[PDB]
Design an enzyme around this catalytic site. Sequence first.
Site, short mmCIF file in Angstrom:
data_model
loop_
_atom_site.label_atom_id
_atom_site.label_comp_id
_atom_site.label_asym_id
_atom_site.label_seq_id
_atom_site.Cartn_x
_atom_site.Cartn_y
_atom_site.Cartn_z
N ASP A 1 0.83 -1.20 0.00
CA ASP A 1 0.00 0.00 0.00
C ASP A 1 0.86 1.26 0.00
O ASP A 1 1.36 1.67 1.06
CB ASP A 1 -0.90 -0.02 1.25
CG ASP A 1 -1.82 1.18 1.33
OD1 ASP A 1 -1.95 1.89 0.31
OD2 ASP A 1 -2.41 1.41 2.41
N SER B 1 -0.56 15.70 -11.87
CA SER B 1 -0.81 15.33 -13.25
C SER B 1 -1.06 16.58 -14.08
O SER B 1 -1.59 17.58 -13.60
CB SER B 1 -2.01 14.39 -13.32
OG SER B 1 -2.40 14.11 -14.66
#
Length: 330
Positions: free
Chosen positions: A35, A199
Amino acid sequence: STGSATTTPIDSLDDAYITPVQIGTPAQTLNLDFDTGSSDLWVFSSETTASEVDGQTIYTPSKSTTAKLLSGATWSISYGDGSSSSGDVYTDTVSVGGLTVTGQAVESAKKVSSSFTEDSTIDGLLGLAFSTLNTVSPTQQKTFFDNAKASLDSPVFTADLGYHAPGTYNFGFIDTTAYTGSITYTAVSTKQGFWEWTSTGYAVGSGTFKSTSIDGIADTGTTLLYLPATVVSAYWAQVSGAKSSSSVGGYVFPCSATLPSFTFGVGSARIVIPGDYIDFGPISTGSSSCFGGIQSSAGIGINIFGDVALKAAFVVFNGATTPTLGFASK
């Protein structure tokens, strides 16, 4: 040193991925959920409340010659999905794909929430976010990667998740055969303890790419792609019959639909998520309505590039002094 381990979806939907991890001496192999959005390595164990164990393989520290109880230490974690677990703390020898860390904090669960009990395939979590998020008290403990880092050939790990198929976590090297084209690297902020990056925009299907900054985290422990409501609405508007359902808990669509791809930007590069990756199957058994793999992050407080996004790429988690993330198509 290096390590290389195969990671395998837990079910036919890629809801999560499990990777075998050797703990203790002699080795006890548990299947852990790696994770990159948390920083605790915790396991079902001989100390876990019996009624809360249902099929999991447990760690038994009393059978390990290298287990050491961290005196007085406790841990307690709550995840974004509302699940939680807590317990006490050992150190022991932990190996992943041939890479060994001695003295790794192995957090033994005394209590786990129902979602963990109900998932027989996941024996615990191995956190790969920054150690600043680790929940051990009174003294925070280091992640497996943080402990291994100085010994690695290169201070990196890579995630290469498969679509309805196994994939690979590598430590300490970049497999240049595992991706197409080049890897584009992008800046990371560690201010919130996550692999947080920006992004450069998105496209829906064959549409023109929209240049816009989207801050989010690379999180292998989250199933879906969670993005701003504007972006998500633009996506589902291109799917006939799609709608947001508050009763179901997100966007749903007719299972017979052809889903468009979704593209996200990494600098001037682009990662294309095929439409099929966005299909999470019937909302309930036998339904002709299906659950979408791109959902709104509104109310989470953060955008999350989860497995839906990450499995479309070869991803480098670069833990050099100034960390970065790399993405390549594959």
